[PDB]
């Protein structure tokens, strides 16, 4: 039952959430990358707040 709680969160392969240069040299990218980025930022910040002994709030 504890597998329903995640410790390691999987990261989908990049070609399935691509960052591609379109015709004009502009970049177009899948929304998952922004969702992963939100996740990573908050996780890293959590590691840092923990290391610095932040208050419980």
């Amino acid at each position: 039952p504890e597998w329903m709680i995640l410790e390691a969160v999987p990261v989908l392969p990049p070609d399935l959430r691509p960052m591609v240069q379109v015709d004009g040299g502009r970049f177009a990218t899948s929304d998952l990358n922004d969702l992963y980025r939100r996740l990573i930022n908050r996780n890293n910040r959590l590691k840092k707040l923990l290391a610095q002994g932040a208050p419980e709030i």
Partner: protein
């Protein structure tokens, strides 16, 4: 030629300016021509006044001004620019402490300008802002669906300008108020407004059982401060009930004109419904430190009175056009303007904290980017901002008059049921009952009626003539639906001698209900039958004889008519086709009286009374949004005396100033060897020979050359590995020359791109070594003609970087545009239609000798199958054909108005005069009746068509009065065994043409993630074989056909490669492999933390990733 017009109805007023719904709305919004001190608080002005003053230092609004457009309209379309004006605002920054005042005029960016015809130019493309129908703000009482003897009171303000409030009498008896999904007893809110039990008991006591449900002792115990804090804790749980915080929230919810706006229409409807007068657009006020009520007590009084059944209290019909209003261009744009302004204001307050609190100007305080963005977003990406339909001039005129219930602030398509889509009785004279889309949007997209106009409040009004005594005045009163319901209105065709009603009983409407009435009871009378229908619908002759379902298609299809090089106005018109060309702005007219000085293909110079010499340049072969050619032709000659309003040039699809959407062709109604089957149409090659139904089309092609990390793209004539045969028509610079004929595969603009760094495969190493030729650094990226396209090159535009007047988007060295034109003859698969909803695709083009023909040798043009008529019940096309026959021999055209038209006797009369020309001529020329004409006459008297005993001439005339003639089969020479209906019909070539739709693909582009073929003809796409197509293959049991669709012909990469290689080698196609999108699905489920495992019969893992994804 002669034009004989029928009908006795005299319409006292002409049609209004047809685009006024657009033009006037926007004029009012910008108030550009009003000097600032004289502006009303409306539109852009009202938005500024709402946003300012920005309190926090205080920044105040003085006035705004609009500059001139940096570039004219033609230039904007050329350069892909928006036609717009610079917006400035004089703002003064004040320090309330010091008194210091710095005042400055800040530049807010640009605002788009409407052209003369009511459209916009946004990034080079013409756009239309479609009006949006919606619920009028106000106070409504609707029945409660759950509890029959109860009602719901809804207080509705303008969109985004406040919450809706719902008043209900709960089963427990206490009157509840619902705001932002929370409910509470209304008694609490009444106490905050300062009401006491004494005032409320005496006021509402008359309605017995309800007032006691309002009485709550605990609420009256607490003073207005305690009741206000109590309400704030109910509405915003968890937010600390600071007394200043509660006042602020409740003020913002009720009395704040910035956060709460009832309409001006909202105010009038409330005042009219509840019988009070509002000091403003808010439900209450904040005055002398407390809240003072305006609306709540009157709605509560009416609500109880309705539940109790007090006379004079009604529920509201919410689909009535008194309760439904239009939001036009000005209002929609102003709304987004108000939004951008609020964002800009947020930035101001945020800038009024930071920086130096001492040295600040308005230029330092204001960032206009939020405003520019809000407007830019509305015009480009809004749903109500649509690519203009300019297939033909009538297309855009109709587009400007459309009404949508969709869009921001409106209905979704699934959430829209029957009630909204219905033709309400109040649509009469306001919204056309006919012109609406077939399909999912039916009843949601509608069209403004011809005589209808939108008032300042946004309600559609329609004209009626006053009738006093029995006398019909010429004074017309424009009425809303609500005011129309008061009177008894006679039909427009009721007989008149002079101004007096000549009938003992008249046909009228009272609240839409038809009734027979005395001339003494007649208060008003319709202006015309034209007022019930849209402009497109008003263009259908004999509309009274057509079932509405086909008239719908007839209306809509005129929109799709292609401008023809030979276009003609119909021989049977309705009398609106001149006005449509004039309001369309396609045709060119003379300003004042004068004499024509010069006439050219390119220009017309006119010398007026003033002596001033005016030159009119003509738009020649310009490409519309849909690629039809807009081109103007001079209709006057050097030295011609013209009056004011005389035609100078014909626009597209007009003939001598009359709307020309098609051609007048000779039609025979008869089956023909099944080429007529199930709406297909047979046409004569003579139509192509004489260039009927030929249309010019222009396609625009574009290519960019940009900087890369690998080196420059270059537009050049030097392209690797191409023969001189391939480069023949390219100039020195690599652009195809004007006048060249280009076919699919041909280079339009030559271009090279630097090869992405790659190591040549050992095969290429060996190949290069064998032939001794260096692999070039650059690759051929040239723009070529796509499959199925091509024509003559009529224009090229080249824009480089670093040349005067032009700056491209970052990285782009140069841009080339090639305009390719084509003269399109009518062909098999092209779609024809008449104005009655008869539509069909051309299935056969016969040589002239096979065409059925008249005794005198004339072949018919088109053969239409009679099987299309009886189920469709559009008989107007038949009457059009009969009258068209008379006109063919008499050499005349007719104007038959809608519902007051040419009737059968009159058409017979013309047919008799026509028969004299068709026959009497022959008898003088020394020919008698034909043997085969006798045989047809024999079968005809067996049919009861002709009277027995009459002469052959007399019988032929009897048939001709029925619109039937003797017809010879061009193949045999023998007659058709019965007399056949033949005449002139007006038929249009629609915008759906096989040249555009034909597509095929072997292999081609695949999608990034799925590796499935792309979609659409423009992408070289594959057809979608969808869920339902798979069911079909499944029901056939075609397992291998289906498996091919799912693997080798789609995303099976190994499989599709192997299949191609096998076919070019003559081998049979190999067994398919795993579709790549299944691998995507597995990996997507792994990303969701689910383990998906393919297993064999032994339940052991099977690796469909072939070891590549496992360590």
């Amino acid at each position: 030629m002669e034009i004989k017009r029928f009908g006795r109805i005299r319409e006292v007023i002409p049609l209004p300016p047809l685009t006024e719904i657009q033009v006037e709305s926007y004029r009012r919004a910008l108030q550009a021509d009003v000097p600032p001190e004289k502006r009303e608080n409306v539109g852009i002005q009202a938005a500024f006044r709402e946003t300012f003053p920005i309190e926090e230092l205080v920044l105040d609004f003085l006035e705004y001004r609009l500059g001139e457009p940096p570039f004219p309209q033609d230039e904007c379309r050329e350069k892909d620019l928006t036609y717009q004006a610079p917006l400035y605002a004089r703002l003064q920054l004040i320090h309330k402490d010091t008194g210091l005042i710095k005042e400055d005029e800040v530049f807010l960016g640009h605002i788009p300008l409407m052209t003369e015809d009511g459209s916009f130019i946004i990034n080079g493309a013409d756009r239309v802002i479609v009006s949006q129908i919606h619920r009028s703000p106000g106070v409504y009482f609707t029945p409660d669906p759950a509890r029959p003897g109860r009602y719901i009171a809804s207080i509705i303000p303008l969109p985004k300008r406040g919450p809706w409030i719902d008043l209900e009498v709960e089963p427990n008896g206490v009157v509840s108020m619902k705001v932002n999904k929370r409910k509470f007893p209304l008694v609490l809110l009444l106490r905050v407004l300062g009401y006491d039990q004494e005032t409320l008991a005496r006021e509402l006591g008359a309605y017995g059982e309800l007032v006691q449900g309002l009485m709550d002792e605990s609420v009256f115990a607490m003073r207005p401060e305690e009741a206000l804090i109590r309400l704030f804790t109910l509405l915003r749980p968890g937010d600390p009930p600071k007394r200043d915080k509660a006042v602020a929230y409740v003020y913002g919810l009720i009395a704040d004109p910035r956060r709460y706006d009832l309409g001006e229409a909202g105010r009038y409807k409330a005042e009219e419904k509840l019988g009070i007068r509002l000091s403003g657009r808010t439900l209450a006020r904040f005055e002398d430190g407390e809240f003072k009520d305006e609306v709540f007590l009157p709605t509560l009084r009416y609500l109880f009175a309705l539940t109790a059944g007090v006379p004079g209290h009604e529920v509201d019909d919410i689909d009535h056009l008194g309760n439904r209003r239009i939001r036009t261009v000005g209002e929609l744009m102003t709304d987004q303007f108000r939004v951008g302004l609020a964002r800009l204001a947020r930035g101001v307050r945020e800038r009024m904290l930071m920086g130096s609190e001492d040295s600040l100007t308005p230029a330092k305080l204001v960032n206009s980017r939020p405003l520019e963005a809000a407007i830019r977003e509305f015009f480009s990406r809004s749903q109500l901002s649509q690519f203009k339909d300019e297939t033909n001039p009538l297309s855009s005129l109709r587009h400007k008059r459309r009404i949508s219930a969709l869009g921001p602030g409106g209905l979704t398509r699934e959430r829209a049921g029957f009630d909204v889509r219905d033709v309400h009785r109040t649509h009469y004279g306001r919204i056309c009952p006919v012109e609406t889309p077939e399909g999912a949007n039916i009843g949601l997209i509608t069209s403004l009626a011809a005589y209808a106009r939108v008032d300042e409040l946004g309600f559609i009004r329609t004209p009626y003539r006053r009738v006093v005594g029995g006398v019909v005045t010429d004074e017309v009163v424009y009425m809303t639906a609500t005011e129309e319901d008061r009177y008894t209105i006679a039909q427009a065709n009721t007989p008149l001698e002079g101004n007096r009603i000549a009938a003992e009983r008249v046909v009228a409407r009272r609240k839409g209900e038809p009734v027979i009435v005395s001339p003494e009871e007649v208060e008003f009378m319709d202006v015309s039958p034209k007022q019930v229908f849209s402009v497109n619908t008003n263009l259908i002759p004999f509309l009274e004889h057509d079932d509405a379902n086909r008239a719908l298609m007839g209306s809509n299809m005129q929109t799709q008519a292609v401008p023809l090089i030979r276009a003609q106005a119909p021989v049977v018109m309705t009398g609106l086709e001149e006005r449509v060309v004039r309001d369309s702005l396609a045709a060119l007219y003379a300003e004042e009286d004068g004499e024509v000085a010069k006439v050219d293909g390119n220009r017309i110079v006119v010398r007026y009374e003033d002596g001033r010499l005016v030159e009119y340049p003509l738009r020649r072969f310009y490409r519309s949004n849909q690629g039809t050619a807009l081109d103007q032709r001079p209709r006057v000659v050097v030295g011609q005396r013209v009056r004011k309003g005389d035609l100078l040039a014909d626009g597209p699809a007009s003939e001598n100033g009359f709307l020309a959407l098609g051609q007048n062709v000779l039609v025979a109604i008869m089956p023909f060897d099944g080429y007529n089957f199930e709406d297909a149409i047979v046409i004569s090659e003579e139509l192509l020979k004489r260039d009927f139904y030929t249309s010019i089309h222009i396609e625009r092609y574009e290519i960019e050359a940009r900087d890369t990390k690998l080196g420059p793209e270059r537009i050049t004539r030097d392209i690797p590995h191409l023969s001189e045969a391939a480069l023949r028509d390219l100039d020195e610079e690599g652009v195809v020359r004007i006048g060249a004929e280009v076919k699919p595969g041909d280079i339009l603009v030559g271009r090279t791109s630097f090869k992405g760094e790659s190591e040549p495969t050992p095969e290429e190493r060996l190949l290069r070594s064998i032939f001794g030729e260096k692999a070039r650094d650059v690759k051929d990226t040239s723009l070529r003609v796509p499959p199925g396209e091509g024509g003559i090159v009529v224009r090229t535009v080249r824009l480089r970087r670093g040349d005067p007047g032009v700056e491209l988007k970052p990285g782009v060295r140069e841009v080339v545009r090639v305009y390719v034109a084509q003269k399109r003859k009518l062909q098999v698969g092209d779609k024809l239609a008449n104005r009655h909803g008869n539509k069909g695709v051309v299935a056969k083009i016969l040589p002239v000798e096979d065409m059925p023909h008249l005794p005198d040798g004339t072949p018919v043009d088109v053969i239409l199958n009679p099987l299309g008529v009886p189920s469709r019940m559009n008989l107007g096309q038949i009457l059009e054909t009969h009258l068209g026959l008379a006109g063919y021999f008499l050499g005349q055209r007719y104007i038959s108005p809608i519902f007051d038209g040419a009737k059968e006797p009159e058409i017979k009369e013309l047919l008799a005069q026509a028969f004299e020309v068709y026959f009497g001529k022959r008898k003088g020329e020394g020919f008698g009746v034909d043997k085969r004409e006798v045989e047809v006459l024999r079968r005809a008297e067996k049919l009861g068509l002709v009277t027995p005993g009459k002469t052959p001439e007399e019988q032929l005339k009897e048939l001709f009065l029925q619109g039937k003639v003797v017809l010879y089969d061009g193949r045999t020479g023998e007659p058709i065994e019965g007399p056949i209906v033949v005449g002139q019909m007006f038929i249009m070539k629609l915008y759906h043409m096989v040249e555009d739709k034909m597509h095929a693909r072997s292999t081609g582009p695949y999608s990034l993630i799925t590796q499935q073929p792309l979609g659409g003809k423009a992408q070289f796409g594959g057809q979608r074989f969808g869920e339902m197509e798979v069911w079909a293959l499944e029901a056939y049991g075609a397992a291998h056909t289906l498996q091919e669709m799912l693997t080798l012909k789609s995303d099976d990469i190994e499989g599709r490669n192997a299949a191609y290689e096998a076919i070019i080698k003559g081998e049979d196609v190999p067994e398919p492999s795993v579709p790549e999108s299944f691998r995507v699905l597995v990996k997507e489920l792994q990303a969701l933390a689910l383990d998906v495992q393919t297993l064999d019969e032994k339940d052991n893992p099977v690796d469909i990733f072939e070891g590549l994804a496992s360590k």
